[model samples]
Target chain A: LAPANSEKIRVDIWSDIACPWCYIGKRRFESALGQFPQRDQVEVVWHSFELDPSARPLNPIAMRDGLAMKYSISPAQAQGSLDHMTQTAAQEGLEYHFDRVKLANTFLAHQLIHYAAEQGQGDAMKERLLRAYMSEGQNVNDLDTLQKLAAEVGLDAGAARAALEAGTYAQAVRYDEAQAQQLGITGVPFFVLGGKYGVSGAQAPETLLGALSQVWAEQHPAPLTMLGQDAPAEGSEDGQCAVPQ
Target chain B: LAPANSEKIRVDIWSDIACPWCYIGKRRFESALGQFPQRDQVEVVWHSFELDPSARPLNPIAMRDGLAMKYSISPAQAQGSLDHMTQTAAQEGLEYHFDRVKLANTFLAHQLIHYAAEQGQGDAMKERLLRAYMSEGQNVNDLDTLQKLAAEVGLDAGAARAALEAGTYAQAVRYDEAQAQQLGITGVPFFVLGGKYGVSGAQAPETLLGALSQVWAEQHPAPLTMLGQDAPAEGSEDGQCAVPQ
Candidate 1:
């Protein structure tokens, strides 16, 4: 039979709203996808992966201070790290204001993304929430703030609030995290390209581009030349769509 | 920090309704899960995988004849294959009725499974359909027959019919199939344990049980020993949940 299945390449990305490199990674992956000839044939799915699952909402303190406290490091060291991250993000055309970041619990934010995903606006909600945490300093844990962000992404704000209040997408967020853990992922910006490749951290756009191309090539092979009888295989692999290579 | 995150081990199975080995595989996997001490922590998710995407509804012919024609083999050869499959299925406590198999296009059946999945009855629907195709000669592609099957599984019959008629879960089925392709799964009964391990075809119960344990052990590791300061690493892995080893 002719292979006429027309399916897009799925890119499942596990990231957190408060993750700095995830934002950079997102921009880089987007750049790669934008430069791809089969860009339209690609589907980007964002999954929830909280770095600090038990993290509380960010107080009035600066992000650097919070980072220093969490890591038991000096504030100056955290600032230096933030400075370099800002430069890297700037190269990717993202203005990440670490000083203004309100690092809060992203559980609610993840649920809101799931809610939007049901409405086919998951990507928009994810992008908006990342900007909200990294640049806009929006309190992601607050229902009103999350609702406003959802509205900005064209999702119904009132419904988004109800969903978050009722914890409708809470299970979905947990499920995504569970899937991430099963994949042995313990960090953010983990991209699973075409369900075959596991790309960790903020990789270069060219690297992600090459990985995408490789998966595409593997799936879409050259036309085959048939030479043998299509008799069913005998053994455990039987009763499946098993064909001899 | 306290680890309060509670998530189950997701076992994604890609199978077809009309597949004989898939029925046997499902029974074996179920036996393994039943024997698992941590079975409550496991979640079985069914995915769609059509062997013949362009296959039409079953014509009024015996399954042996159809298999013989498709494989370009003699009817005796097809019957021999079927006889062996029936005996293997019997060993798994499944009475395979290949003589009465409708062997229809399972596209609509897959869609119904997706619909039931929305109502959190994906597994039940999957089991019912597998039995329908393998043991009973149910017309899986027929809307009325599919609605009845969904009702048997406690899903709303009217809603199932509406969803099937309007092709609501059509995209979901296609998405599952696409993911299976990306995972390079060309056969039925392919089990993805914990999103990390892929077990092809109908594996033995003991083998599946071992796989489940292996994934569980990897995810729930022993407590780690702290040997260094909790300062964030400086480099590309920075901006994520980077910890000193």
Candidate 2:
């Protein structure tokens, strides 16, 4: 049998559900993708990159306090950092409420994303989870919440629960992390365009757009060698073909 | 942050375990990929395409008799068809032992492939299943046999059975089929290169190679715009840049 026509420029992104920069990056990438001329030909795949793989699902420490304690900084310094992040997010049309954030492990949340990917709602699921954690302050680690979120994204809630309960995508998440490690990815919001070029951090939409355009140009170049086409002879009429003068 | 470099061309194939052409196509594609200059940069993704979705796991009819019954053909005609297929397969270095082939349903086999895909052994699993049914005549619908085959492919047998028992990848298989339907794919051995071009049937390695080359060129074109670089002045030597003499 012959092969059918199918082509998509894949962009793989690695980010954690709770990473603030990831949400901002997601918005920026969305803006860039929306502006890409061949956007419809591009496909975005989200991979799990847990910042704190060992973190507990239930934590008493508040996000601000935890940030201050983890960095050995003053509470005021942490507040300043949060304010900066919030302002930056505001620029991207994202609302970030660090005070309302709930610190929790996101392993189950990553699995839910994988489950959603299997159902072809991966992008929606990733968007919903990011918004839930960054804006709604929802604990993505919780099963009930995840199932509800899954439904909101038009996924089968019961199926999502069953898959998560069974830990079906545990290995899939691990594989994504393994690939990230192999690629020397040490931070969230990392974008791999065309599986060849890597863009780190929450870059500006223009920068991301440039990288996408550059990669697309280099990888999927238009044909330079053109076969003979129907061109009019030197004095031929516009709609008619004729021999050369 | 700036972008890093990463790239791999993806090749997605839609095939069925029961489809003989898919097995042959797999071999031909492998041959084409091996000869491809950027072989290491190519990633092959196997997809599910069920030839018989309503097939029962348990069946008493033999493969030959079933083929005859389904097509309303004579026993001699069925044998002729099978013989022609076997001979065609031999050209590709594959042994088709229809005499020992089984007629069980392939839905479970499809699920196993999806499970293997999650673990990054999808190619191995697909190869094994095709050989199992086409050569060894194993009933792919059987859990024990599939578990054993999984082990042979470096997959965890117990986990394979657990995944199968839980029907973890049932949806994954269905999703693949749904995509196939959307693509208007009515046959196995369909190859989608760079996610755009479609080549149908078990094409010759040359045809597949041409398609791959064409798609790779169109999708990932090398940059024609070169930045400024050192060049010799009119009278200068290669290693030295100087004012024109």
Candidate 3:
């Protein structure tokens, strides 16, 4: 039988539950993948990346003040970030209720993601988490919020709670973080294509589509020619180089 | 205090010792790698690929006959392929001695490459094998010839012979072959960048350079911004994504 167009193009996204651009990038990446002719063969996997490793539990303080203090800037400057992100998110058809988005420890959220991945709802949970944090202004760090979200994504609520409480998925999150660190990634919304190429930031859909095309092109190449794509037609014998399938 | 240019790009190549295009691809890939400003940070690794997995040991038969037999083509057609390859090789500053080339199993050469890799002379050995096979027709399938070539590349002759004869690196070769199979690589001179992007065949130097730069750019990007690279870019502390040291 001729070769089947069956190799699933893999995409590994390293993101945080709280990063604005990560969600935007996810949308753009999915958009690009959807437009790809071989979208059915593309496999998207999410990895863990915390925006603030030192972030504490949900604080009563506002996200604006936290951003302001963290950057040594005034609240007005933080508002600019909010405005920019809100505008950009809108461009991606995502609403940013920055006025209500809370600052909380994303470690638990990342663990829930790991748990969801083990339950075959990784992508669903990732989508739910991004929406829960950015669109709904839900406190993603809250255990009850995580349990509900996990259950919403078809994960067993009790299993999700036990895994989060026992820190079961902590190692998986750490493994992803370690991989990101090894790959020299320092930003959210980082996408690794087929575990080889890295696409950082919330790049435009065209950029991600280009990445997907390039990966697919190599995985399924045209044909091998001994003569450079130049030499006057080498005849069918050149085609006889006999490549394995 | 600022973003550092400190990422080592990894490129893994799968090639066949007896394949002319593999040698040509190797040269073109090397030429491109050489011109890359980040050449020092580029780590190139070679993997095993066999042109004829069921190939017999160096037969007294001519390569022309083997090509004709394998492809069910006339000797004339195979000669045409040889000519085209010779012409292409010349363009790459390489000389193909097809007249003197012997038909042989590439499995042993692949094992030698595995052994060389363990000895940290993998690159040197791959270069020698290609040059011996396509450039000089050195009957690389012969253990004596392999031992001599290994010694020329500064590899321990005894270690090379012992490993080759005892089949020490055979498993390593098999492992790489299995991986190649899993990767759906059917051709020689396959270049895998970052394990995600694939460049098949001995593409032009410019094409290879484009790939190298693209991967490096994605892996080591400038700081992420709230808006795209253009959004009036709010200054400072926004730079405080706080990447761990």
Best-performing candidate as measured by lDDT: 1
Candidate 3: residue A243 lDDT (0-100): 33
TM-score of chain B of 2: 0.84
Q: State every prediction's TM-score relative to the real structure.
A: 0.45, 0.45, 0.45
- Cα deviation at A121, candidate 1, in Å, is 1.5
Model 3 chain B: ten consecutive residues of lowest lDDT:
B231-240
What C-alpha lDDT do the candidate models reach, one value each?
0.86, 0.85, 0.83
lDDT of 3 by residue, A195-227 (tens): 688887999999999999999898888877664
Expressed as tens digits, the lDDT of each residue in B143-166 for candidate 2 is 999999999999999999999999
Per-candidate TM-score, chain A:
0.86, 0.84, 0.84
Q: lDDT per residue, candidate 1, B1-245, as tens digits?
A: 11133556778889998889998998899899999998988877778999898898767689999999988999999999999999999999899888888868999999998889889998899989989888888889888889999999999999999999999989999999999999899898999887788899998999999999998888888879996334322221223333343
DockQ of each: 0.01, 0.01, 0.01
Worst lDDT 10-window in candidate 2 chain B: B230-239
Name the weakest run of 10 consecutive residues (lDDT summed) in model 3 chain A.
A231-240
Q: Mind sharing the TM-score for model 1? A: 0.45
What residue runs in model 1 are displaced by over 4 Å at the alpha carbon?
A1-6, A225-245, B1-245
